[PDB]
């Protein structure tokens, strides 16, 4: 794990709010990877 050393953009309410509501970004890369592979193929 990596720990952020910069000021968090999310206010303390937001972090609690977000956790109230494996990774979307990771799946975002997966879709792009498939698109890049398909175009290259």
């Amino acid at each position: 794990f990596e720990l952020s050393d910069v000021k968090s953009s999310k206010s303390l309410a937001e972090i609690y709010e977000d956790d109230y509501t494996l990774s979307e970004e990771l799946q975002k890369a997966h879709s792009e990877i498939s698109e890049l592979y398909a175009n290259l193929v």
Binding site: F1, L3, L12, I15
Partner: protein, 53 residues
């Protein structure tokens, strides 16, 4: 998962009861003389535990 205001020699910590105690320990270690790098490592350890629970 807290917020800290360092007003001169006066420290205020905002957060949940368990969270502010965790922040207080790290701050106190720094006051007692622990170098920041060593405190940063322990923060990573507790930060990992916080996610699994």
């Amino acid at each position: 998962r807290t917020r800290i205001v360092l007003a001169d020699s006066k420290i205020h910590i905002l957060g949940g009861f368990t969270h502010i105690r965790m922040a207080r320990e790290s701050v106190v270690s720094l006051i007692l003389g622990s170098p920041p790098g060593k405190v940063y490592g322990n923060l990573r350890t507790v930060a990992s535990r916080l996610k699994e629970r």
